[PDB]
Ligand binder design. Structure first.
Ligand SMILES: [K+]
Ligand SMILES: [Mg+2]
Ligand SMILES: [Mg+2]
Ligand SMILES: [Mg+2]
Ligand SMILES: [Mg+2]
Ligand SMILES: [Mg+2]
Ligand SMILES: [Mg+2]
Ligand SMILES: [Mg+2]
Ligand SMILES: [Mg+2]
Ligand SMILES: [Mg+2]
Ligand SMILES: [Mg+2]
Ligand SMILES: [Mg+2]
Ligand SMILES: [Mg+2]
Ligand SMILES: [Mg+2]
Ligand SMILES: [Mg+2]
Ligand SMILES: [Mg+2]
Ligand SMILES: [Mg+2]
Ligand SMILES: [Mg+2]
Ligand SMILES: [Mg+2]
Ligand SMILES: [Mg+2]
Ligand SMILES: [Mg+2]
Ligand SMILES: [Mg+2]
Ligand SMILES: [Mg+2]
Ligand SMILES: [Mg+2]
Ligand SMILES: [Mg+2]
Ligand SMILES: [Mg+2]
Ligand SMILES: [Mg+2]
Ligand SMILES: [Mg+2]
Ligand SMILES: [Mg+2]
Ligand SMILES: [Mg+2]
Ligand SMILES: [Mg+2]
Ligand SMILES: [Mg+2]
Ligand SMILES: [Mg+2]
Ligand SMILES: [Mg+2]
Ligand SMILES: [Mg+2]
Ligand SMILES: [Mg+2]
Ligand SMILES: [Mg+2]
Ligand SMILES: [Mg+2]
Ligand SMILES: [Mg+2]
Ligand SMILES: [Mg+2]
Ligand SMILES: [Mg+2]
Ligand SMILES: [Mg+2]
Ligand SMILES: [Mg+2]
Ligand SMILES: [Mg+2]
Ligand SMILES: [Mg+2]
Ligand SMILES: [Mg+2]
Ligand SMILES: [Mg+2]
Ligand SMILES: [Mg+2]
Ligand SMILES: [Mg+2]
Ligand SMILES: [Mg+2]
Ligand SMILES: [Mg+2]
Ligand SMILES: [Mg+2]
Ligand SMILES: [Mg+2]
Ligand SMILES: [Mg+2]
Ligand SMILES: [Mg+2]
Ligand SMILES: [Mg+2]
Ligand SMILES: [Mg+2]
Ligand SMILES: [Mg+2]
Ligand SMILES: [Mg+2]
Ligand SMILES: [Mg+2]
Ligand SMILES: [Mg+2]
Ligand SMILES: [Mg+2]
Ligand SMILES: [Mg+2]
Ligand SMILES: [Mg+2]
Ligand SMILES: [Mg+2]
Ligand SMILES: [Mg+2]
Ligand SMILES: [Mg+2]
Ligand SMILES: [Mg+2]
Ligand SMILES: [Mg+2]
Ligand SMILES: [Mg+2]
Ligand SMILES: [Mg+2]
Ligand SMILES: [Mg+2]
Ligand SMILES: [Mg+2]
Ligand SMILES: [Mg+2]
Ligand SMILES: [Mg+2]
Ligand SMILES: [Mg+2]
Ligand SMILES: [Mg+2]
Ligand SMILES: [Mg+2]
Ligand SMILES: [Mg+2]
Ligand SMILES: [Mg+2]
Ligand SMILES: [Mg+2]
Ligand SMILES: [Mg+2]
Ligand SMILES: [Mg+2]
Ligand SMILES: [Mg+2]
Ligand SMILES: [Mg+2]
Ligand SMILES: [Mg+2]
Ligand SMILES: [Mg+2]
Ligand SMILES: [Mg+2]
Ligand SMILES: [Mg+2]
Ligand SMILES: [Mg+2]
Ligand SMILES: [Mg+2]
Ligand SMILES: [Mg+2]
Ligand SMILES: [Mg+2]
Ligand SMILES: [Mg+2]
Ligand SMILES: [Mg+2]
Ligand SMILES: [Mg+2]
Ligand SMILES: [Mg+2]
Ligand SMILES: [Mg+2]
Ligand SMILES: [Mg+2]
Ligand SMILES: [Mg+2]
Ligand SMILES: [Mg+2]
Ligand SMILES: [Mg+2]
Ligand SMILES: [Mg+2]
Ligand SMILES: [Mg+2]
Ligand SMILES: [Mg+2]
Ligand SMILES: [Mg+2]
Ligand SMILES: [Mg+2]
Ligand SMILES: [Mg+2]
Ligand SMILES: [Mg+2]
Ligand SMILES: [Mg+2]
Ligand SMILES: [Mg+2]
Ligand SMILES: [Mg+2]
Ligand SMILES: [Mg+2]
Ligand SMILES: [Mg+2]
Ligand SMILES: [Mg+2]
Ligand SMILES: [Mg+2]
Ligand SMILES: [Mg+2]
Ligand SMILES: [Mg+2]
Ligand SMILES: [Mg+2]
Ligand SMILES: [Mg+2]
Ligand SMILES: [Mg+2]
Ligand SMILES: [Mg+2]
Ligand SMILES: [Mg+2]
Ligand SMILES: [Mg+2]
Ligand SMILES: [Mg+2]
Ligand SMILES: [Mg+2]
Ligand SMILES: [Mg+2]
Ligand SMILES: [Mg+2]
Ligand SMILES: [Mg+2]
Ligand SMILES: [Mg+2]
Ligand SMILES: [Mg+2]
Ligand SMILES: [Mg+2]
Ligand SMILES: [Mg+2]
Ligand SMILES: [Mg+2]
Ligand SMILES: [Mg+2]
Ligand SMILES: [Mg+2]
Ligand SMILES: [Mg+2]
Ligand SMILES: [Mg+2]
Ligand SMILES: [Mg+2]
Ligand SMILES: [Mg+2]
Ligand SMILES: [Mg+2]
Ligand SMILES: [Mg+2]
Ligand SMILES: [Mg+2]
Ligand SMILES: [Mg+2]
Ligand SMILES: [Mg+2]
Ligand SMILES: [Mg+2]
Ligand SMILES: [Mg+2]
Ligand SMILES: [Mg+2]
Ligand SMILES: [Mg+2]
Ligand SMILES: [Mg+2]
Ligand SMILES: [Mg+2]
Ligand SMILES: [Mg+2]
Ligand SMILES: [Mg+2]
Ligand SMILES: [Mg+2]
Ligand SMILES: [Mg+2]
Ligand SMILES: [Mg+2]
Ligand SMILES: [Mg+2]
Ligand SMILES: [Mg+2]
Ligand SMILES: [Mg+2]
Ligand SMILES: [Mg+2]
Ligand SMILES: [Mg+2]
Ligand SMILES: [Mg+2]
Ligand SMILES: [Mg+2]
Ligand SMILES: [Mg+2]
Ligand SMILES: [Mg+2]
Ligand SMILES: [Mg+2]
Ligand SMILES: [Mg+2]
Ligand SMILES: [Mg+2]
Ligand SMILES: [Mg+2]
Ligand SMILES: [Mg+2]
Ligand SMILES: [Mg+2]
Ligand SMILES: [Mg+2]
Ligand SMILES: [Mg+2]
Ligand SMILES: [Mg+2]
Ligand SMILES: [Mg+2]
Ligand SMILES: [Mg+2]
Ligand SMILES: [Mg+2]
Ligand SMILES: [Mg+2]
Ligand SMILES: [Mg+2]
Ligand SMILES: [Mg+2]
Ligand SMILES: [Mg+2]
Ligand SMILES: [Mg+2]
Ligand SMILES: [Mg+2]
Ligand SMILES: [Mg+2]
Ligand SMILES: [Mg+2]
Ligand SMILES: [Mg+2]
Ligand SMILES: [Mg+2]
Ligand SMILES: [Mg+2]
Ligand SMILES: [Mg+2]
Ligand SMILES: [Mg+2]
Ligand SMILES: [Mg+2]
Ligand SMILES: [Mg+2]
Ligand SMILES: [Mg+2]
Ligand SMILES: [Mg+2]
Ligand SMILES: [Mg+2]
Ligand SMILES: [Mg+2]
Ligand SMILES: [Mg+2]
Ligand SMILES: [Mg+2]
Ligand SMILES: [Mg+2]
Ligand SMILES: [Mg+2]
Ligand SMILES: [Mg+2]
Ligand SMILES: [Mg+2]
Ligand SMILES: [Mg+2]
Ligand SMILES: [Mg+2]
Ligand SMILES: [Mg+2]
Ligand SMILES: [Mg+2]
Ligand SMILES: [Mg+2]
Ligand SMILES: [Mg+2]
Ligand SMILES: [Mg+2]
Ligand SMILES: [Mg+2]
Ligand SMILES: [Mg+2]
Ligand SMILES: [Mg+2]
Ligand SMILES: [Mg+2]
Ligand SMILES: [Mg+2]
Ligand SMILES: [Mg+2]
Ligand SMILES: [Mg+2]
Ligand SMILES: [Mg+2]
Ligand SMILES: [Mg+2]
Ligand SMILES: [Mg+2]
Ligand SMILES: [Mg+2]
Ligand SMILES: [Mg+2]
Ligand SMILES: [Mg+2]
Ligand SMILES: [Mg+2]
Ligand SMILES: [Mg+2]
Ligand SMILES: [Mg+2]
Ligand SMILES: [Mg+2]
Ligand SMILES: [Mg+2]
Ligand SMILES: [Mg+2]
Ligand SMILES: [Mg+2]
Ligand SMILES: [Mg+2]
Ligand SMILES: [Mg+2]
Ligand SMILES: [Mg+2]
Ligand SMILES: [Mg+2]
Lengths: 275, 48
RNA sequence: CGAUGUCGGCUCGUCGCAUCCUGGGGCUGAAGAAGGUCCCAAGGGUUGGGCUGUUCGCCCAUUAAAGCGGCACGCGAGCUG
RNA sequence: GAAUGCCGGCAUGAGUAACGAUAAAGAGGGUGAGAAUCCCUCUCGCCGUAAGCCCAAGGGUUCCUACGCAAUGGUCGUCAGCGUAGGGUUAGGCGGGACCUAAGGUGAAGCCGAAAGGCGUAGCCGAAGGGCAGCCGGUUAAUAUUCCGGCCCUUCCCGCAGGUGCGAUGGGGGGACGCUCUAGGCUAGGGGGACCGGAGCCAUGGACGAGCCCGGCCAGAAGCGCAGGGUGGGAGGUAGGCAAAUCCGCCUCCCAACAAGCUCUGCGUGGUGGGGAAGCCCGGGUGACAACCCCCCGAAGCCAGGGAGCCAAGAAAAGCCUCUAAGCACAACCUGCGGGAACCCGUACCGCAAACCGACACAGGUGGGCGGGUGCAAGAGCACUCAGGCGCGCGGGAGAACCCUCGCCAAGGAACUCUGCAAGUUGGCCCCGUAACUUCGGGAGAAGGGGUGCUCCCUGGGGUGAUGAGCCCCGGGGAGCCGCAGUGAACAGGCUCUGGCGACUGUUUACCAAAAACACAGCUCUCUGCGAACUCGUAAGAGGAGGUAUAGGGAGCGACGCUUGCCCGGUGCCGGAAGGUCAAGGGGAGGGGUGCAAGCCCCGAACCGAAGCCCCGGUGAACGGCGGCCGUAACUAUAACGGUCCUAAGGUAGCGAAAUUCCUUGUCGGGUAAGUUCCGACCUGCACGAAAAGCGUAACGACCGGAGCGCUGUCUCGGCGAGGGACCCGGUGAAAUUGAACUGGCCGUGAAGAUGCGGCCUACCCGUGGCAGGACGAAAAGACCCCGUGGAGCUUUACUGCAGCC
RNA sequence: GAGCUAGCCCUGGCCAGGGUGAAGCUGGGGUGAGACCCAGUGGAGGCCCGAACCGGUGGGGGAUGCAAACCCCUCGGAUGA
RNA sequence: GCGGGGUGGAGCAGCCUGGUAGCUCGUCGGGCUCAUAACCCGAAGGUCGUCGGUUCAAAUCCGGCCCCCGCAACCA
RNA sequence: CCGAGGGUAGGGCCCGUGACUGGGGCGAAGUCGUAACAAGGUAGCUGUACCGGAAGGUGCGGCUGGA
RNA sequence: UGGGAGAGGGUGGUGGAAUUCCCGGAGUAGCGGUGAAAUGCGCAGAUACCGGGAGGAACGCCGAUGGCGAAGGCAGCCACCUGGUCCACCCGUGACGCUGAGGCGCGAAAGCGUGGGGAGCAAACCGGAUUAGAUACCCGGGUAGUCCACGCCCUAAACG
């Protein structure tokens, strides 16, 4: 769900926070956390390369297991469900019968104390990982490798999923969270079910300060600048664009398609995205 | 008000220092020039 | 143009008279009172407010009257701004 | 002889301004050639969440003592942060290094770049973060946790004893974490005492007193007591923690679990060692065999890795413990005791300032800790004051104008003015009470009122104790007293009604703009399938992101409410395997040059030939755009209606003389005695209008309008008073400016505004305080305007290139 | 050249005192069970008032300054972007 | 001050490229209808804002005069 | 002490009036159309929504008081 | 106690027909639409036909003048959970009843909020015709919406 507040300040009026209903552990696994290096959007030259970034809360990185075929046949119990500040999804703690402890992103309906497993033979149960080819057409799925053994790259965001539509040769057809219809290799792993914390998008930040907590620095409009800074800069008083809307670097920003035409992966994308 | 010179021994040695000069092409040319002129000091004085 | 600060206000005046008032006259379609119009006259006087940056103007309450112009549209090494 | 020339020297302004916070001085004594200024004493004032004390930057001998006064010191100087000389900084435990890592830097491997060089996992470097052993007093002119004294401790080396599978750069544990709130128990600190110790004191009317005044502790190993922190024990299995592992992890089983035990800190006590006031004598000595006790207040500090709640989800690595690997088990390690060993650097002094940053002994700037007492609700606020530190390095007079800062003011009360600008008013706390409207929070401190001191009596509850006394903290009810006045001093909202703009808290033009601008949650469009798009880079490599479409980039709009109409002809973007054009290249009808020829060489049409453009569609919260004329209703007027021209389509809702309206102070209504402003309406909207959003909107605003109440020196209209200056005397002594000057008025004249020319008028020679009309006064080679085939920023469907992309 | 200034990164530190009183929790009422209402408890917030601290709104002064941006009075924020 | 306009009664072609004025509505006569509108069949009406010129010839080309909308009026 | 009442401040209800504005009723022979009553020439009515000079139209569902 | 009929309600699942779109194949000169036509679509290969895929919505025949519910209303099939109701038997309780101002709950469609979904249909809107006009009727397009979840709205020719 989503928690509202009484309007006892101007900002509490619209602010909403997560209920954190599914969380069962309030601090992470020491062996599974490493220090996150905050960049501020600066590359190794130290130049800002992504604007308007920095100043957010300190975070620890929770090492996530995006392989899972790492430990085929070895079951694990769901020890806990935890908060992860580095992603939208919640994460679940797995104590394998191995005695090994790992983090995966928690699928919807995953419950603590249940058992999950990974492998070709695995049961079609929420929280189980299988190569795509062994998963029944039609079941919803997440954390999908894009290429075999290269790691789960698709559908990791809260509430997202992909759905298996059919098979062709060594490939299956997925409908991605975006509505793109794509061919992904049959030996690519994926976890059945959808990612949890679907209510995540219903969150209203509420005040400028909350964006600031998340490390998002204020975004200043092109139209608010000067010609030296931006195509939309200048003009006496307010001005309309006066040219096709452009980025600070001058390329067109309303409809100009930008994916490279001669990309090798074009052979594997059947239908470009939805809405 | 707060003025522009705010002395800092570590800052001084690290920025204008002999070793900072020696590491860079432009810095070595500085040393070469100040030696050519006959500068008594090639590098700012700082008590470290 | 190797600079003569530029509106209006305020302060401080001073001058002209083509005179607003006050004093003196002629004519009147001047009965009286009160006006009209011209002549002589610059000694003194020529209010307080509402509106507007305003000068000007309109308005309110008066007044003998609420003059008009010059002085770098008087006056920023006097003030305002 | 001129270049607002250059370097220097010396003038003028001028004995002029000034002499750097308005915290403030006076006298006596002394030193000396010389004293407002140095030393001493007494008296006065100033700071005291500092203007006192400690630490860190930074400075670098400025520190202490002797001897000096040319210069430095805004005056003086015998003095000094000045001159000369001598002296002065003492560590295993404090800080840093011989330890650890953070960003970042560097960088074996490796990658990239014409050269220079760029990058880069590990490793290394890197601290005000982690880790680690010293507290109290005494001593010097000057150092002290450093020397000395007392009591403690750490590591290394060697040895002895005991014990154990010893052994690591490898495994694991631990280190190891936020914000807000907060418990128990302590301590730092502080208040009181009729108790204890102490020189003395009795004044001027009273007091020989349960009088006054002073002081009543600090450090402390083991052990012990109190309060806390950390921590389960055993067994079996084991495939995970890149080898091993009895460790750790995972599963099972027995036992106990706000315990206890083991452990570690804090506080208390503690052998012992210290200190020890006023006052009075000369820093010292006495006090003094000083006493060293009880009660209360009590931290933000300590126990601390305590606890609870919340979301934005809160370093690393070593020390340390445990596990084992080679190895080695006459070794090694652990524990206890003993002896030996323990290095390098800093240590003076200034440190909110006269020694640091500001050219100055400059009203500015400068991080951390301590910061006492009383009263005022609290407090680091305010007033006074302790300790401590100062009177700010020119003074003495006078008692003008005028200036500044300040105080009061008859009657009036905004009549001032662009504007109540400024200054009044209000002002803390407790109680009563509090409207429209609203998003139900608010609007609220709404507004508006009442209370407030002191004394006596009665009484309720809490803390500490003991359940009592005492001390301490909340109160309540009677009855009185005084003054003009009881938050009696200081600190401490004026209020309301109504518009515009922006939702809000925020942000900005350092140094003329804080705003209606920027930002902002929120809304929409668009791009992006991940080796993402995009960005920086020649590249490698980075950011994006150790993220993955509920995500990331770009754009516009800007909480929220109700909404966001019509036009796709032009430009943009998107789609379109047709057709059209289209470069290199392919092709080679057909010519050409040369040669005796084979040959070599050259040109060359049709036709095949990408993207782009053309062409066919789509597309508005893409760029944008959203008519004209003529006629018509049974009074008139107007025109629901019609005619016609043009368009890609002719502006919908809602607004409207507006932050927009030219005519314009439109017209009408409101408010005023009077209203170019204001509010409400009307609508021929010069020239609103729907995300360069339209219309509203509670709350918010050092935003900009209009009005009213309150209260006023704003004003009628000024007056008086205070201090700091101005003035005078002693001291020190600038400045811009300056062709030279023996530098008057009028009316003329003159390059058209004359001290300088003409005519006339006036005028003894030289100053001082004042005022500003002139010297087209000063300052700045006008920033407006033009000129230069001068320059720079910026734009685009100007030209021509380049990157980038195709 | 980022010892000024702008942003970000790492690691530390700071914010007297007072006020308002959200969610939750407890009890009670309520209902078939609920919603929900009441009281207490509680201590949220780019909440309120106000020092330090960070500012720089209006006025006055200063203008060869104490200062090449200062001084006085007033005023903004002060648990947070 | 610069640009486009004036032509049957209304609103527009024709002008540029000289000879020949045309379109929709309106109006007039006739039809359909009980009647009116719509509809159907026919017709009338400009002498091209004016004066001046060029020409064999002027709506048309050139000049002035009258009017009608529009764009402009900036530096202080 | 209470106290008529005077005064200050803030509320509540009612009444009159107000530029302008909104529809309503009425009114012998106005303009535009023709929605409804005959299947009224698209059966009507309807709740609601959107739109349009106007009656109205259209969508969705309902009723027959229509076929 | 024993039994029965039923589209009564909620949840989860699931089946085939049709439409649309996409991909392949085959095939060519029109298709579509009307009163007639035009817009539209089609040599850039449409329509018509065959195979493949995706998605949404509604459930043909049974089906009735039928059934259930208090009403609004409820129709493929399966399972689960749940309401009403009729009959028999003649077993129990002993008037425990009827109605019901307030209150409370339910309440077709349209509509509203947040999030999904979106094939067909279709307010608004565009276009083509008709017409004196045609902001309509007819035709070709087409957005909310119609569908799902949660929360509002609380109306009706909510009628027998
Ligand atoms: K100008
Ligand atoms: Mg909320
Ligand atoms: Mg709340
Ligand atoms: Mg949630
Ligand atoms: Mg959750
Ligand atoms: Mg770790
Ligand atoms: Mg780097
Ligand atoms: Mg670099
Ligand atoms: Mg960017
Ligand atoms: Mg950035
Ligand atoms: Mg999460
Ligand atoms: Mg992958
Ligand atoms: Mg694949
Ligand atoms: Mg969530
Ligand atoms: Mg922005
Ligand atoms: Mg701008
Ligand atoms: Mg730039
Ligand atoms: Mg540009
Ligand atoms: Mg622009
Ligand atoms: Mg602009
Ligand atoms: Mg503009
Ligand atoms: Mg796609
Ligand atoms: Mg400074
Ligand atoms: Mg340093
Ligand atoms: Mg340093
Ligand atoms: Mg430094
Ligand atoms: Mg160096
Ligand atoms: Mg030398
Ligand atoms: Mg150098
Ligand atoms: Mg000039
Ligand atoms: Mg000059
Ligand atoms: Mg000059
Ligand atoms: Mg007379
Ligand atoms: Mg007279
Ligand atoms: Mg008379
Ligand atoms: Mg006179
Ligand atoms: Mg006169
Ligand atoms: Mg005036
Ligand atoms: Mg005027
Ligand atoms: Mg009179
Ligand atoms: Mg008279
Ligand atoms: Mg002048
Ligand atoms: Mg003049
Ligand atoms: Mg003048
Ligand atoms: Mg003047
Ligand atoms: Mg001036
Ligand atoms: Mg002036
Ligand atoms: Mg002057
Ligand atoms: Mg002058
Ligand atoms: Mg010469
Ligand atoms: Mg000169
Ligand atoms: Mg020169
Ligand atoms: Mg001189
Ligand atoms: Mg002088
Ligand atoms: Mg001076
Ligand atoms: Mg001075
Ligand atoms: Mg004295
Ligand atoms: Mg002296
Ligand atoms: Mg002397
Ligand atoms: Mg002195
Ligand atoms: Mg002395
Ligand atoms: Mg004090
Ligand atoms: Mg120095
Ligand atoms: Mg001297
Ligand atoms: Mg001297
Ligand atoms: Mg001397
Ligand atoms: Mg000497
Ligand atoms: Mg001197
Ligand atoms: Mg001297
Ligand atoms: Mg000085
Ligand atoms: Mg001497
Ligand atoms: Mg010394
Ligand atoms: Mg020592
Ligand atoms: Mg060594
Ligand atoms: Mg080291
Ligand atoms: Mg290291
Ligand atoms: Mg380093
Ligand atoms: Mg190091
Ligand atoms: Mg360190
Ligand atoms: Mg140490
Ligand atoms: Mg010690
Ligand atoms: Mg061992
Ligand atoms: Mg951690
Ligand atoms: Mg730390
Ligand atoms: Mg928090
Ligand atoms: Mg406590
Ligand atoms: Mg102690
Ligand atoms: Mg006390
Ligand atoms: Mg005694
Ligand atoms: Mg094992
Ligand atoms: Mg192992
Ligand atoms: Mg003794
Ligand atoms: Mg590390
Ligand atoms: Mg061995
Ligand atoms: Mg041996
Ligand atoms: Mg042992
Ligand atoms: Mg050494
Ligand atoms: Mg020392
Ligand atoms: Mg300090
Ligand atoms: Mg000091
Ligand atoms: Mg000093
Ligand atoms: Mg100095
Ligand atoms: Mg300097
Ligand atoms: Mg001084
Ligand atoms: Mg100073
Ligand atoms: Mg107080
Ligand atoms: Mg003084
Ligand atoms: Mg002084
Ligand atoms: Mg004096
Ligand atoms: Mg005097
Ligand atoms: Mg005074
Ligand atoms: Mg007075
Ligand atoms: Mg008044
Ligand atoms: Mg008054
Ligand atoms: Mg006024
Ligand atoms: Mg005003
Ligand atoms: Mg006052
Ligand atoms: Mg006060
Ligand atoms: Mg309310
Ligand atoms: Mg009050
Ligand atoms: Mg008293
Ligand atoms: Mg106040
Ligand atoms: Mg206005
Ligand atoms: Mg703003
Ligand atoms: Mg604002
Ligand atoms: Mg707004
Ligand atoms: Mg708003
Ligand atoms: Mg906003
Ligand atoms: Mg500024
Ligand atoms: Mg500036
Ligand atoms: Mg200013
Ligand atoms: Mg402000
Ligand atoms: Mg905003
Ligand atoms: Mg929005
Ligand atoms: Mg680039
Ligand atoms: Mg990364
Ligand atoms: Mg991402
Ligand atoms: Mg903005
Ligand atoms: Mg905007
Ligand atoms: Mg509203
Ligand atoms: Mg268009
Ligand atoms: Mg188009
Ligand atoms: Mg287009
Ligand atoms: Mg070619
Ligand atoms: Mg092509
Ligand atoms: Mg008429
Ligand atoms: Mg318009
Ligand atoms: Mg429209
Ligand atoms: Mg106007
Ligand atoms: Mg208007
Ligand atoms: Mg007006
Ligand atoms: Mg306008
Ligand atoms: Mg005007
Ligand atoms: Mg007027
Ligand atoms: Mg009026
Ligand atoms: Mg108005
Ligand atoms: Mg009008
Ligand atoms: Mg726009
Ligand atoms: Mg727009
Ligand atoms: Mg408001
Ligand atoms: Mg504001
Ligand atoms: Mg603000
Ligand atoms: Mg403001
Ligand atoms: Mg005065
Ligand atoms: Mg005085
Ligand atoms: Mg002076
Ligand atoms: Mg001197
Ligand atoms: Mg001079
Ligand atoms: Mg001379
Ligand atoms: Mg003379
Ligand atoms: Mg002349
Ligand atoms: Mg003259
Ligand atoms: Mg003369
Ligand atoms: Mg002469
Ligand atoms: Mg002569
Ligand atoms: Mg003469
Ligand atoms: Mg004369
Ligand atoms: Mg003068
Ligand atoms: Mg003067
Ligand atoms: Mg002058
Ligand atoms: Mg100047
Ligand atoms: Mg020059
Ligand atoms: Mg010049
Ligand atoms: Mg100049
Ligand atoms: Mg000019
Ligand atoms: Mg040229
Ligand atoms: Mg030239
Ligand atoms: Mg040029
Ligand atoms: Mg340039
Ligand atoms: Mg690009
Ligand atoms: Mg910096
Ligand atoms: Mg710095
Ligand atoms: Mg911190
Ligand atoms: Mg604070
Ligand atoms: Mg507080
Ligand atoms: Mg409470
Ligand atoms: Mg609070
Ligand atoms: Mg606050
Ligand atoms: Mg400042
Ligand atoms: Mg200020
Ligand atoms: Mg003021
Ligand atoms: Mg001034
Ligand atoms: Mg200045
Ligand atoms: Mg100041
Ligand atoms: Mg505040
Ligand atoms: Mg505070
Ligand atoms: Mg923060
Ligand atoms: Mg033509
Ligand atoms: Mg008949
Ligand atoms: Mg007829
Ligand atoms: Mg002829
Ligand atoms: Mg002719
Ligand atoms: Mg002709
Ligand atoms: Mg002719
Ligand atoms: Mg012709
Ligand atoms: Mg115009
Ligand atoms: Mg211009
Ligand atoms: Mg001008
Ligand atoms: Mg009375
Ligand atoms: Mg009809
Ligand atoms: Mg009908
Ligand atoms: Mg009909
Ligand atoms: Mg009918
Ligand atoms: Mg119409
Ligand atoms: Mg319609
Ligand atoms: Mg009927
Ligand atoms: Mg073909
Ligand atoms: Mg019976
Ligand atoms: Mg009933
Ligand atoms: Mg309903
Ligand atoms: Mg519905
Ligand atoms: Mg008809
Ligand atoms: Mg029925």
């Amino acid at each position: 769900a989503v928690k509202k507040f009484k309007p006892y300040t101007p900002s509490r009026r619209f602010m909403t926070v997560a209920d954190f209903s599914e969380i069962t552990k309030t601090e992470p696994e020491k062996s599974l956390v490493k220090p996150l290096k905050k960049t501020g959007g600066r590359n190794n030259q130290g130049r800002i390369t992504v604007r308007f970034r920095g100043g957010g809360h300190k975070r620890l990185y929770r090492i996530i297991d995006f392989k899972r075929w790492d430990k085929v046949g070895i079951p694990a119990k769901v020890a806990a469900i935890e908060y992860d500040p580095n992603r939208s999804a919640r994460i679940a703690l797995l104590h394998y019968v191995d005695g090994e402890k790992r983090y995966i992103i928690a699928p919807d309906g995953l419950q603590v104390g249940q058992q999950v497993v990974a492998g070709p033979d695995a049961p079609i149960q929420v929280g189980n990982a299988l190569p795509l080819r062994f998963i029944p057409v039609g079941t919803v799925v997440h954390a999908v490798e894009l290429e075999p053994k290269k790691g789960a790259k698709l559908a990791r965001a809260a509430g997202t999923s992909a759905q298996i539509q059919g098979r062709e040769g060594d490939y299956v057809i997925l409908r991605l969270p975006s509505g793109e219809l794509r061919k992904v290799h049959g030996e690519c792993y994926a976890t059945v079910g959808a990612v949890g914390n679907a209510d995540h998008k219903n969150i209203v930040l509420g005040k400028a300060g909350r964006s600031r907590w998340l490390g998002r620095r204020p975004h200043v409009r092109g139209a608010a600048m000067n010609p030296v800074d931006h195509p939309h800069g200048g003009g006496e008083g307010r001005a309309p664009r006066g040219r096709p809307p452009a980025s600070p670097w001058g390329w067109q920003t309303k409809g100009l398609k930008t994916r490279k035409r001669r990309k090798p992966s074009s052979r594997f994308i059947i239908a470009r995205r939805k809405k | 008000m707060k003025r522009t010179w705010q002395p800092n021994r570590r800052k001084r040695a690290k920025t204008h220092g002999f070793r900072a000069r020696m590491r860079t092409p432009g810095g070595r040319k500085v040393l070469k020039r100040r030696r050519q002129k006959g500068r008594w000091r090639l590098t700012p004085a700082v008590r470290k």
